[PDB]
Swiss-Prot record, chain C:
It is found in: Plastid, Chloroplast thylakoid membrane. The gene is psbC. Phosphorylated in vitro. This is Photosystem II CP43 reaction center protein. The chain holds residues 163 to 212 of 461 of the full protein. The chain crosses the membrane at residues 4-26. Coiled coil: none annotated. It comes from Chlamydomonas reinhardtii.
UniProtKB/Swiss-Prot annotation, chain D:
This is Photosystem II reaction center protein Z. The gene is psbZ. Keywords: Chloroplast, Membrane, Photosynthesis, Photosystem II, Plastid, Reaction center, Thylakoid, Transmembrane, Transmembrane helix. Coiled coil: none annotated. Disruption phenotype: Not essential, grows like wild-type at 25 and 17 degrees Celsius and from 20-200 umol photons/m(2)/s. Loss of PSII-light harvesting supercomplexes. Loss of PSII-light harvesting supercomplexes without a decrease of major antenna proteins, at 17 degrees Celsius and 100 umol photons/m(2)/s loss of minor antenna chlorophyll a-b binding proteins CP26 (Lhcb5), decreased levels of CP29 (Lhcb4), less extreme pheotype at 25 degrees Celsius and the same light. Altered phosphorylation state of PSII and LHCII, impaired non-photochemical energy quenching. GO terms for biological process: photosynthesis; photosystem II stabilization. It is found in: Plastid, Chloroplast thylakoid membrane.
Curated annotation (Swiss-Prot), chain F:
The keyword Transmembrane helix applies. Belongs to the PsbK family. It comes from Chlamydomonas reinhardtii. Its main location: plastid. One of its GO terms (biological process) is photosynthesis. It is found in: Plastid, Chloroplast thylakoid membrane. One of the components of the core complex of photosystem II (PSII). PSII is a light-driven water:plastoquinone oxidoreductase that uses light energy to abstract electrons from H(2)O, generating O(2) and a proton gradient subsequently used for ATP formation. It consists of a core antenna complex that captures photons, and an electron transfer chain that converts photonic excitation into a charge separation. Required for assembly and/or stability of PSII. One of its GO terms (cellular component) is photosystem II reaction center. It is a single-pass membrane protein. The keyword Transmembrane applies. This is Photosystem II reaction center protein K. PSII is composed of 1 copy each of membrane proteins PsbA, PsbB, PsbC, PsbD, PsbE, PsbF, PsbH, PsbI, PsbJ, PsbK, PsbL, PsbM, PsbT, PsbX, PsbY, PsbZ, Psb30/Ycf12, at least 3 peripheral proteins of the oxygen-evolving complex and a large number of cofactors. It forms dimeric complexes. This protein is tightly associated with CP43 (psbC), one of the core proteins. Keywords: Chloroplast, Membrane, Photosynthesis, Photosystem II, Plastid, Reaction center, Thylakoid, Transmembrane, Transmembrane helix.
From Swiss-Prot, chain G:
It comes from the Eukaryota. One of the components of the core complex of photosystem II (PSII), required for its stability and/or assembly. PSII is a light-driven water:plastoquinone oxidoreductase that uses light energy to abstract electrons from H(2)O, generating O(2) and a proton gradient subsequently used for ATP formation. It consists of a core antenna complex that captures photons, and an electron transfer chain that converts photonic excitation into a charge separation. Keywords: Chloroplast, Membrane, Photosynthesis, Photosystem II, Plastid, Reaction center, Thylakoid, Transmembrane, Transmembrane helix. PSII is composed of 1 copy each of membrane proteins PsbA, PsbB, PsbC, PsbD, PsbE, PsbF, PsbH, PsbI, PsbJ, PsbK, PsbL, PsbM, PsbT, PsbX, PsbY, PsbZ, Psb30/Ycf12, at least 3 peripheral proteins of the oxygen-evolving complex and a large number of cofactors. It forms dimeric complexes. The chain crosses the membrane at residues 4-24. Disruption phenotype: Able to grow photoautotrophically only in dim light, oxygen evolution is 10-20% of wild-type, reduced accumulation of protein D1 (PsbA). The keyword Thylakoid applies. It is found in: Plastid, Chloroplast thylakoid membrane. GO terms for biological process: photosynthesis. The keyword Thylakoid applies. Belongs to the PsbI family. It is a single-pass membrane protein. It comes from Chlamydomonas reinhardtii (Chlamydomonas smithii). This is Photosystem II reaction center protein I.
Amino acid sequence: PDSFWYGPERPLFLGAFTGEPPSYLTGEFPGDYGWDTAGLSADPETFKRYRELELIHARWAMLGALGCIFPELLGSYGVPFGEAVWFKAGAQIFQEGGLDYLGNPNLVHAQSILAILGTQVLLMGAIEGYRVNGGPLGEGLDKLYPGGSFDPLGLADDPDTFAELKVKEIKNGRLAMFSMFGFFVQAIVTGKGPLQNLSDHLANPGTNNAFAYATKFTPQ
Amino acid sequence: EFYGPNRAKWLGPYSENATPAYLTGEFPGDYGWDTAGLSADPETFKRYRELELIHARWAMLGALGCITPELLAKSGTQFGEAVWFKAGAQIFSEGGLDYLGNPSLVHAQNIVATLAVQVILMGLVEGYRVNGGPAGEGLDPLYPGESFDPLGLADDPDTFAELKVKEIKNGRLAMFSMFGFFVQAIVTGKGPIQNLDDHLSNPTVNNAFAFATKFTPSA
Amino acid sequence: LVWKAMYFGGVYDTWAPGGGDVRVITNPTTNAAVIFGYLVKSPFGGDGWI
Amino acid sequence: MTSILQVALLALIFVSFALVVGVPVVFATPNGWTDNKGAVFSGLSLWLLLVFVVGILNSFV
Amino acid sequence: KATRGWLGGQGGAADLDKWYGPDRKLFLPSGLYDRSEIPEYLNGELAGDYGYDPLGLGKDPETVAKYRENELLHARWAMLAAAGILIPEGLQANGANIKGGTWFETGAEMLNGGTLNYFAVPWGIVSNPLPLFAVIAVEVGLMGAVEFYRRNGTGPAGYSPGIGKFDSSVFDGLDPLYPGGPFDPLGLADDPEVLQELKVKEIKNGRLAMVSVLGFAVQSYVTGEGPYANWTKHVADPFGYNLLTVLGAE
Amino acid sequence: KLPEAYAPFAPIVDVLPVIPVFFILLAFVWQAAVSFR
Amino acid sequence: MLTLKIFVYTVVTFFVCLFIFGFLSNDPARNPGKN
Amino acid sequence: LVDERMNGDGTGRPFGVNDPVLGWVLLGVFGTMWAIWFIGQKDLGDFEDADDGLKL
Ligand code: CHL
Ligand SMILES: CCCCCCCCCCCCCCCCCC(=O)OC[C@H](CO[C@@H]1O[C@H](CO[C@H]2O[C@H](CO)[C@H](O)[C@H](O)[C@H]2O)[C@H](O)[C@H](O)[C@H]1O)OC(=O)CCCCCCCCCCCCCCCCC
Ligand code: CLA
Ligand code: CLA
Ligand SMILES: CC1=C[C@H](O)CC(C)(C)[C@H]1/C=C/C(C)=C/C=C/C(C)=C/C=C/C=C(C)/C=C/C=C(C)/C=C/C1=C(C)C[C@H](O)CC1(C)C
Ligand SMILES: CC1=C[C@H](O)CC(C)(C)[C@H]1/C=C/C(C)=C/C=C/C(C)=C/C=C/C=C(C)/C=C/C=C(C)/C=C/C1=C(C)C[C@H](O)CC1(C)C
Ligand SMILES: CCCCCCCCCCCCO[C@H]1O[C@H](CO)[C@@H](O[C@H]2O[C@H](CO)[C@@H](O)[C@H](O)[C@H]2O)[C@H](O)[C@H]1O
């Protein structure tokens, strides 16, 4: 296309020091900064599969980051969750009262983990089978951008706006995946919720940073 | 030898049929070991070669910089902390980080400033390597020469190829040794020179098998 | 101004014990919340803004 | 040496008055800046020399 | 020799019209110094030419070159001297046992039978066991040989400076004050316009070093301490410790 | 008070603060010189 | 009594946001002159 | 205490909020208005060129 994010004049991941990007990264796909130093996308089929994997990971991680942030914020403000922290919310089902959505005893009130696992397995199996092979909500649609019933508001009719929104989606998804990797590492190292880590850093930025835990995993 | 068809191989004599077709002994250190077939595509092969060379050089530097302070401390120099995997924590000491223990050298006390300076300088130099900079622009990505070969030790082609093979072999040895450093530090918990001294003290009992049951999953 | 108050002499602290005097501000309040609470504080009585 | 300091300070005052009276005249007079560069340079240099000398004398008093 | 800029983009000598040619920078601004009064012998040829010559000490181009030789030699010696005056004092004041300390006291440290400690920044500090007379003899012999080589224009063949190209034989044809070749192991002077820019930088840094060394001497005579001590004390107490305070302390 | 060495120059200082005001008046005088062109 | 505070805050915020975003909506080009 | 009060006159709370619902209302209203303005921005004309806008 003819836009700032496509073609040979697109921005690249090393600024002026990037040089010439790899030949197969011609710049016809969203979020193409020409960063394939490892050379894992030489084969176009592998490139397509990696693009699909990246997009699915991006959407899942956007959802995951939002769902990790929101309950802890609400619990900090005062909502009585069973376990507000993202990496502890799974253990609520072992509590005597069971899992309670929003802390209310009349919302969901789940008791058995086996039923949750079984229903999730069935529903998600059907969902992903429909995603791979066309189902009730469209049959002959694109694998990554089905549109149709999944774009009710008609935000992707204009091809130029469609490309712009694709770039925005991929960029926000990459940011979300980076932040989710940060979530995992901070949970492993610090042991507190991400909002707790942010509050601690804001309280004393000079000392409450990552280096404070640097001497945590040293062997003895 | 070390080049062409009749070159040394990764299985010695029992290697005539082991070598893949695409490995034809054109590049240095080509022993024909691609059992997993990860470099069938020539572009991926070139990228892996570049990664291997950079890793080898960094591993050479890392191995030398891990060995040197411990030996110097054994010689009788007070470093504050000589063990390689504990040498980064002395930046938080009250006396700061002093080169060779001398209080009038470096004497760094802030870690954020050092990290920022390293980020800026290393970003600039890595960008110079990728696309070219003050030293030169149109040179080989792996062997620029010119400003990076002042003594001119690489000017006759066969000598250049032999030196390249020596470089790659020393680098593979350094990478293996650095992986050993990491595993020994995780398992044993003492510096590599201390480990060597302990092994020399009593080899029959001071070996890796003494720590076999350390990571038993009993619970 | 910060260097003058911190290293080269000091500033006249009027809240020092007894009558105020010149003092060096060794620990300025750099906390973000405390610093930015003044700006968003109400200007009416009791609060007084900055 | 207060007498020397006071004499130098009075000389500085006189030189400064002469400069502030003359510089606008030299600037605004057509074809005057070209043929009076030396006088203006000497006056400014003398002003700077006198103020520095007064400072040194104050340090000595 | 194809290079790129330090911060990306094209690399080279940028623009050389600021220091060469009829258009250039001068020791006074445009409004105070018209281009007509520039002396005829002060044309945009020599590096670092600001059209500065009150009292007309220079008369014509060959005398200008004769004085340029002395200016460049003095500049390089003053750069070396400023470095060797500043660094050892700062090293000693921070913990090292240099035993020489301030520059104006290092000479007397080697009087009588005394020796001098030499610090190899990265590496240790050694106690150089040479006596004073041996130092004098070695210095006079080596400096005489080197200056005789410089004056004659020819010298011995193939010494060992870590040079990029070895086995130097003849010095014939090398420009005095810029021999290059054997004296340029890194080969940074191959590009001509880059060489001109480097010449300008060299002469400017050298003039700064000359003025700084004169300041070293004068303020060390006045205050009685080394330049490093004066710098640190002034930074610690700007208004308390300066020239005006030092003068007439009693 | 001023330092004793600068004691005799006390009257001059007494006139200094009002000098900027005169500047504005000078402007009008200048306009009178050019007949308010 | 806090419900009144919520209502007043909502109304004031709505009007202030209207004012702020009104002048960001290419206001200087609303003149009737020719340019 | 005879009755109940908010007790926040002289506390100097930021933006005069002492309950998180007030801050949530502030952010929600501001975000809704900003979203409406962002959606309607297409009708205001784009100043993409470097030299554009009312000027003299
Ligand atoms: C003729 C006999 C001969 C044999 C059998 C080999 C075989 C080998 N050579 Mg070769 N070579 C041989 C002759 C020669 N080599 C070479 C030159 C080279 C080079 C330069 C290299 C090799 C390498 C290799 C290795 C490649 C495969 C590998 O990585 O193994 C991996 C699998 C094993 C080693 C088996 C597993 C070990 C053990 C039995 C299991 C351990 C169990 C643990 C306790 C597990 C516990 C952990 C738990 C917690 C999970 C392999 C050991 C490469 C190498 O050494 O990489 C490591 C290499 O770089 N060879 C020359 C010179 C021309 C030879 C001359 O005859
Ligand atoms: C009042 C004081 C309060 C206290 C102090 C607060 C300080 C806050 C400081 C930071 C924010 C300052 C914002 C000032 C207002 C100016 C906003 C503006 O001029 O913004 C103008 C720009 C214009 O953006 C451009 O708009 C263009 C036009 O787009 C249009 O056209 C495009 C195709 O060309 C697309 O089709 C697109 O969809 C279509 O809209 C393009 O899209 C460009 O890519 C795009 O960059 O916007 C942008 O800068 C991007 C948005 C900027 C940040 C906005 C944050 C808003 C709040 C977020 C959180 C809300 C939460 C709500 C929760 C609700 C539920 C509880
Ligand atoms: C990439 C590899 C690498 C890395 C990341 C490090 C990192 C570190 N080293 Mg190690 N080191 C290395 C390679 C490396 N070293 C090698 C190859 C050597 C052998 C020369 C050493 C010898 C060494 C010693 C002896 C000491 C360290 C120390 C340190 C720490 C302080 C760094 C500092 O302030 O230096 C920056 C210092 C300066 C800029 C001051 C000038 C020093 C110059 C640059 C040295 C240059 C050496 C020269 C180029 C090569 C040797 C020449 C010789 C053959 C003649 C830091 C953890 C110090 C420490 O904390 O002890 C544990 C310490 O005492 N290192
Ligand atoms: C806002 C202030 C300002 C600005 C933008 C300029 C800008 C300019 N001046 Mg003017 N000038 C100024 C103040 C200023 N000057 C003052 C205060 C003086 C009296 C000394 C002069 C005297 C002067 C002369 C005589 C001439 C110019 C000329 C010029 C032009 C080119 C040469 C140049 O940059 O000046 C060069 C000025 C200097 C080298 C003075 C030294 C400046 C150094 C960097 C000290 C900086 C101090 C520090 C950064 C700020 C101190 C803050 C506080 C103590 C006040 C340029 C358009 C020339 C021109 O246009 O020719 C036709 C010319 O002939 N200026
Ligand atoms: C580019 C390139 C190039 C060259 O050549 C080579 C290389 C380098 C290799 C490459 C790179 C790559 C990368 C970087 C990657 C990364 C990734 C990631 C990080 C992802 C994430 C990703 C991430 C993700 C998905 C995430 C997700 C999440 C989730 C789901 C979550 C969930 C949840 C929640 C909500 C909360 C609750 O309570 C619980 C749970 C349930 C848990
Ligand atoms: C061939 C093949 C074939 C088939 O087909 C397949 C397969 C098998 C896969 C393949 C194989 C491969 C391999 C073996 C690999 C390995 C690698 C390595 C080991 C690396 C390292 C690598 C390593 C490295 C880099 C290292 C580095 C290091 C460093 C830097 C260090 C540094 C340091 C020092 C000095 C010390 C101080 O105190 C600090 C620090 C800072 C810490
Ligand atoms: C380029 C511009 C730089 C300007 C210089 C910056 C100001 C620093 C110089 C200050 C003058 C020198 O100060 C030095 O001599 C003065 C002599 O009168 C002393 O000043 C003294 O004068 C009187 C006694 O005669 C007393 O009323 C003062 O309390 C006393 O301070 C200073 O105590 C001394 O430190």
